[PDB]
Design a protein around this ligand. Structure first.
Ligand SMILES: CCCC[C@H](NC(=O)c1[nH]c2c(c1C)C(=O)CC(C)(C)C2)C(=O)NCc1ccc(CN(C)C)cc1
Ligand SMILES: CCCC[C@H](NC(=O)c1[nH]c2c(c1C)C(=O)CC(C)(C)C2)C(=O)NCc1ccc(CN(C)C)cc1
Ligand SMILES: Nc1ncnc2c1ncn2[C@@H]1O[C@H](C[C@@H](N)CC[C@H](N)C(=O)O)[C@@H](O)[C@H]1O
Ligand SMILES: Nc1ncnc2c1ncn2[C@@H]1O[C@H](C[C@@H](N)CC[C@H](N)C(=O)O)[C@@H](O)[C@H]1O
Ligand SMILES: [Zn+2]
Ligand SMILES: [Zn+2]
Ligand SMILES: [Zn+2]
Ligand SMILES: [Zn+2]
Ligand SMILES: [Zn+2]
Ligand SMILES: [Zn+2]
Ligand SMILES: [Zn+2]
Ligand SMILES: [Zn+2]
Lengths: 273, 265
């Protein structure tokens, strides 16, 4: 086992993200460009108009019920330490509207967690069965911001012709025109987070410096206390596995695994009779 | 006010008034980065970024971004080299998200933000101004001219040009700090200036949209008012409404200076 890179983010995050390999001879991944914030190749025509921001008139730290930005998700879901409240809906999370440059409040108000970046210590590591993965190097309480799903913002039409969908994330569940983040060519640490059938982080859609609802940003928060050494993972979703399961099956090893060869076979044999 | 920037800069920018009873200004919105109010089609395509292949601190002459800048003009402490053309500054291309270097390389001064202590204050004759609260060595990055990116056509429609900065394209775009701006909107004209504007590219390289960075052109002492040369064009427009009050012996735009040149004719 060897530390093969001290910081895959090259200093772009608040904290380093080392890479270790104790499984094989694979060097730290080079077949992508690490970026800390979303990029575009062809333009997405994002509405950046500062006058199109809903914003608040608070002169405190935006902890009162009078903060419009909080009201845009019924309430601000962050406590004084930046963690999601206990009663936050982790099954169907609301859209979060953080404070922004139009708000009268200060940059250090309580409604600005995701825009402040990575704070926890993570490690890129070689897994036994799933390629690279990401694990915690510290205790992470439930409700803590982990990292953003960062990559190249692309259209539905462009996503459809991309050869590799292994790093592709669509931004809404609906049937219409849905934009995507493709982390294949450009991405951050999130591109390495694997699927777990017993996940410990959840994606939350967030708005910060724009409120172009076509382009929510994807923030991962812990859904339970996470222990040092624990692999991070979220539920990729059934749609992902419907596509992929003819190529590989889930190796998460959970007793609750929904997408292993065994689980899939038990499903099909249920119908084979 | 302890900080007109509301915590958005690396350091506070306090405001004081020891001249009259005017409250610190509130007839604008402080923003720390440029904004837009109608679509500005800036080319942000990451594949269009020229970028370097350095793994050093980008002080090497092999750094492409340095070469794009003619050379990297930053010394080890982030200050412009003496050889920098302060009369007609070049374009600076800082490193960006496409470069292979680390975020702490030597070619990222402007994108790292304000480091010096400044103060918004009431001047005797020129309204509000900005002054240093520390010694500032020559070549030091001070602040960016931040405001609302607008087209020249939009600029022509607007009533007030007192906070309008022409990016000098030859289609034309401007930064209007009238409604949205940062501390730079308060920096006055001086005929004996101590800072200079420099065109800089950082996260995009759309040459239609340079960002404007101010650097000190000489050592500045604590308490000294900051100022740059607004340019003859500004004064050709404005001299019919007011004249220069900078009070320098080399003042070019005072009523007296103007009258002398006119009577000469
Ligand atoms: C590799 C990233 C995880 C796996 C990933 N998951 C999600 O996109 C997703 N979207 C939402 C979630 C997740 C997990 C949520 O949980 C909720 C959400 C509202 C954020 C909406 C996926 O399924 N990738 C295949 C793929 C994506 C997109 C296309 C392009 N078009 C055909 C749609 C093709 C293939
Ligand atoms: C209040 C800001 C200082 C004064 C200001 N100075 C500059 O714009 C300027 N531009 C460059 C400089 C300066 C000082 C430089 O030094 C060099 C540069 C290449 C950065 C190009 C000005 O002249 N404002 C009147 C004004 C601007 C724009 C319009 C709209 N269109 C007719 C263009 C009308 C009136
Ligand atoms: N639960 C899983 N079981 C098997 N393979 C997985 C699982 N989760 C992620 N993967 C693999 O990881 C890919 C998704 C990537 N976004 C994650 C990083 C990937 N492990 C890598 O090494 O680059 C999938 O297409 C699979 O190849
Ligand atoms: N040298 C000067 N002489 C007279 N007035 C000046 C001078 N420099 C700047 N000004 C004034 O300041 C305006 C430019 C502003 N960007 C500077 C801040 C301005 N002093 C204010 O109080 O808002 C000009 O239109 C003038 O009203
Ligand atoms: Zn608020
Ligand atoms: Zn706020
Ligand atoms: Zn707000
Ligand atoms: Zn599983
Ligand atoms: Zn370089
Ligand atoms: Zn560099
Ligand atoms: Zn570079
Ligand atoms: Zn003068």
């Amino acid at each position: 086992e060897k530390i093969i890179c001290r910081d895959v983010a090259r200093g772009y995050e608040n904290v380093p993200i080392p890479c270790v390999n104790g499984v094989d001879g694979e060097p730290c991944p080079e077949d992508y460009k690490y970026i800390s914030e979303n990029c575009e190749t062809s333009t997405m025509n994002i509405d950046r108009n500062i006058t199109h921001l809903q914003h608040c008139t608070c002169v405190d730290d935006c902890s009162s019920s009078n903060c419009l930005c909080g009201q845009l998700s019924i309430r601000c879901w962050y406590d004084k330490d930046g963690r999601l409240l206990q009663e936050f809906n982790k099954i169907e999370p609301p859209l979060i509207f953080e404070c922004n440059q139009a708000c009268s409040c200060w940059r250090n108000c309580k409604n600005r967690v995701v825009q402040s970046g990575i704070k926890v210590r993570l490690q890129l590591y070689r897994t036994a069965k799933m390629g690279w993965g990401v694990r915690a190097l510290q205790t992470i309480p439930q409700g803590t911001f982990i990292c953003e799903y960062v990559g190249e913002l692309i259209s539905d039409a462009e996503a459809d012709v991309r050869e590799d969908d292994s790093y592709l994330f669509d931004l809404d569940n609906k049937d219409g025109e849905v934009y995507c983040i493709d982390a294949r060519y450009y991405g951050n640490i999130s591109r390495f987070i694997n699927h777990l059938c017993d996940p410990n982080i959840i994606p939350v859609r967030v708005f910060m410096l724009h409120q172009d609802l076509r382009f929510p940003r994807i923030a991962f928060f812990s859904s339970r206390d996470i222990r040092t050494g624990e692999e991070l993972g979220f539920d990729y979703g059934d749609r992902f596995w419907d596509i992929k399961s003819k190529y590989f099956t889930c190796q998460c090893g959970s007793e609750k695994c929904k997408h292993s060869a065994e689980a899939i076979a038990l499903e099909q044999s249920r119908l084979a009779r």
